[PDB]
Design a protein around this nucleic acid. Sequence first.
RNA 1: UGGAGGUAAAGCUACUGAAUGUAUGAUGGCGCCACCUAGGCGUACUGAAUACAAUUAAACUCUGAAUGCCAUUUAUUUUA
RNA 2: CGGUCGCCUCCUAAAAGGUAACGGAGGCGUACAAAGGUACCUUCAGUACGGUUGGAAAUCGUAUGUAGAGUGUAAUGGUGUAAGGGUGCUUGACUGUGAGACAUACAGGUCGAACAGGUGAGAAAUCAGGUCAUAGUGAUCCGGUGGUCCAGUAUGGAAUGG
RNA 3: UUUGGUGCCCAUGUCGCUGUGGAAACACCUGGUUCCAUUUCGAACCCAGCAGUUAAGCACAGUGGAGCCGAAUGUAGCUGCAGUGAGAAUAGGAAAGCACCAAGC
Lengths: 50, 44, 136, 175, 112
Amino acid sequence: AVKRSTRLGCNDCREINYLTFKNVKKNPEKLALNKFCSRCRKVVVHKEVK
Amino acid sequence: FHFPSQSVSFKCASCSNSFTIESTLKQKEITIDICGKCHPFYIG
Amino acid sequence: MLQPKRTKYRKPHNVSYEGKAKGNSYVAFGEYGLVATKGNWIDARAIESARIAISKCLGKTGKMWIRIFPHMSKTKKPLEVRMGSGKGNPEFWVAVVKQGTVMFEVANIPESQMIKALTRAGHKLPVTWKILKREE
Amino acid sequence: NLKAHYQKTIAKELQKSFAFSSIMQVPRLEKIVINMGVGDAIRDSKFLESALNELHLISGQKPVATKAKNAISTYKLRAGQLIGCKVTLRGERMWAFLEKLIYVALPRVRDFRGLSLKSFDGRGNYTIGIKEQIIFPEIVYDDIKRIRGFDVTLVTSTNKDSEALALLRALNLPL
Amino acid sequence: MKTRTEQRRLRHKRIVKKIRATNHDNRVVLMVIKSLNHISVQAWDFSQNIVLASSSSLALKLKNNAKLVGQDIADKLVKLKLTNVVFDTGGSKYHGRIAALAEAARERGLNF
RNA sequence: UGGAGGUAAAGCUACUGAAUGUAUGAUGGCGCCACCUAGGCGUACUGAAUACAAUUAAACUCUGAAUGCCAUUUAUUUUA
RNA sequence: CGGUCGCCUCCUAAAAGGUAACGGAGGCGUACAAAGGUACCUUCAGUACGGUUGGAAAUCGUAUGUAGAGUGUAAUGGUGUAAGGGUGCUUGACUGUGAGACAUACAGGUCGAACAGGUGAGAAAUCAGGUCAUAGUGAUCCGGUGGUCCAGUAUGGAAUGG
RNA sequence: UUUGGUGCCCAUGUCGCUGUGGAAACACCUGGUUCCAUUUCGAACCCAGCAGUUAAGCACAGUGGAGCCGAAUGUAGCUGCAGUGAGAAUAGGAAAGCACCAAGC
Ligand SMILES: [Mg+2]
Ligand SMILES: [Mg+2]
Ligand SMILES: [Mg+2]
Ligand SMILES: [Mg+2]
Ligand SMILES: [Mg+2]
Ligand SMILES: [Zn+2]
């Protein structure tokens, strides 16, 4: 297999909410989206977590 | 949004005439040797 | 030897000839034609033998039209081998001939000579032949 | 402006030349395009910028560069890597950049004798090719390391080519 | 190539296809047709394919800043107590005259 | 009674492969002269493309059933 | 000895669905922060005439053509104003759920109206719970990592568990 | 009833050829200074104006050219030798049809 997935975590409360897929070999940039966070109850910026 | 076009003139050198339409506006009323009524295929 | 230059799929389903001649029902180019009364498979080798018989007996005056063609291939498992474990290689091509297909037909040469040419042809083919003439 | 001469005389002239009784059955010149085909940008010779700048210089239209719609392995042009450039100029610009050729440029050609006997499409178009862009006045001696020509077209609003003959003759083109 | 009017009819077909596929309620669609000389409106009640009301410059008006074709049709529909429509720009763009019509239509008791 | 479907059969200038003939003949090959390159001559032949006639197909389809199937109506029967 | 061992598409498969063989052909063990979502605009490839570099074939305008083009990829199905190409804005490639069905031995898989929270695009209706669809993956145990309106072998903590 | 708009129908609705008409309307057209816009451009989108136009689009009459549709008989397959019935081929049709709305009628 290839372990291409990755995990997004909120920055205010630092939980590890979301899971997605990203191909490092092309876009080395760290993803920074903004999605719903269950603890914070609103759309917060999520950034990647190892 | 483009180069500063304008209504530039011209200057004939042999036909004793003139033209004025548009070009780069840094050289208004420019003279050229072979004029509008110069080339034999144009007249004759 | 008549043989398609190249085919898509090398090992197809065998075509049963038990019918009444879809297509090629009637003679279409010459005055006389050879018809079958029992459908069968005649390979390229038999078409070659029939063609050369007609040509040899036809002389340098007339024309012969072959209507059928060995479109379909056919396989043959190599000898002294158990069954299963694959499908055998293709060996020889064959033209399916339903009952009543005008397969050979001749032109531009006297009557009796054409009848004799056709009889000399149909003895190479397995199908029980018959003689038909063009309509009008 | 050359448009002045047209809207002053040509309508009546070609209306009487052919029995029409419809003031605008006369052919109307609709657009002019300019193309060069800058294919010496295999990967990056000067990346087309010289062509863009010079074509901007000649015409008030801002040039646009087309991307390849094909894939060709014979060269380094496959599925992208924009080549060439294109101007489609009209309005006052169409009439004026036209005469600016015929009254300035073509007398400055290497040899301007005659054409247009067989260059019609047969549906009301015409084309002119130039082997070098250095001839035209709206440029200085400095250019790209190579000097290329131009491809210009005259398309009108008629499909019968003899009408295009009539329109271009009424406008004093070198036949 | 195209005739600037068959093309507009095509854009209208696109829009009406989206509407006829999406309109789950029976909301009456409000079609506006823009002509170079003036403008007209008609309110097609789909699911029966009949027309409910209409308006135009030809209601003894002038050449179309004539949002008056909005107030009158708003009045005619609110007299039919529907007041929940969906707008249809024909093939036009929701801008200029069409916008001036639609805003007038909204501000007199419509809901769309 | 309404409906999905793409079989049997049929058909192939209605596409995909295969493929027969006659007419027009390109691509070419045999020669062939000039000319050293741009090329001409008739081609016993291979046949672009088209027309006319005629063909084949499990993995070909412009077309296309019957039986079978699904659900429903009506009559009768069975409490599975 | 050799070959194969799961998953996906066609044919065989007999016009519903299913249907075996060491039967006939082929693919996968993904790819894309845009090839997602939304508004707006736009719609083939090819051939013929016409044109400097430029050639069979680049590009340019013109017509012609009814798909032979495109559709990330195997085959099939579907799709020419679309589900294809370009642009602006974003991240719904959401959280918590789930009536009712499909196909199923079990496990599992698939589709999904509708409801609440808080969003994106848009004038608005509307659309959006990943892509045109079909593969792209592997139970349990054990152990580790992050959060915690759980317990803490008398009590308070902790270790250890949940 | 005719003109314009538009939905339903998907070619017996097309593709084309020859003519006729444009008061009201539909486009053309005239300008781009405004709102807005082009991979660039008032081409297009979008404004605001109708001097000229029946040329073109639009409509109407005629056109059996291609394309399209296609009866009956007979046949092939079927399902217990009768009913079922196609395909292809043919005579031949065919210059669309159904509604609602605004105008002058
Ligand atoms: Mg069959
Ligand atoms: Mg998409
Ligand atoms: Mg995709
Ligand atoms: Mg995908
Ligand atoms: Mg304790
Ligand atoms: Zn958070």
